[PDB]
């Protein structure tokens, strides 16, 4: 299944959105977190599902300095 997140609107798979314990509690549509930070969370979900238990080497998840604090706060909440 697919689920909808709101900051802007984002749609991700439920197997990806389950990477968040908080979203896995709310889902068992969610509106929050600015779009520029919630899209970065949607990019982390794709990064996590792609590279968890991957046989390849794994690339550093890139984080911009200006979003570091906003994204840390969101990640600590999620």
């Amino acid at each position: 299944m697919y689920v909808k997140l709101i900051s802007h609107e984002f749609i991700v798979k439920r197997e990806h959105a389950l990477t968040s314990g908080t979203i896995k509690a709310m889902l068992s549509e969610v509106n929050f977190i600015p779009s520029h930070v919630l899209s970065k969370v949607c990019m982390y979900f794709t990064y996590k599902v792609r590279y968890t238990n991957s046989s390849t080497e794994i690339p550093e998840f890139p984080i911009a300095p200006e979003i570091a604090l906003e994204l840390l706060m969101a990640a600590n909440f999620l």
């Binding site: 990019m43 794709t46 599902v49 792609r50 590279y51 690339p59 998840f61 890139p62």
Partner: peptide
């Protein structure tokens, strides 16, 4: 890229 989709 998963961490930087197009």
């Amino acid at each position: 890229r998963p961490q930087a989709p197009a």
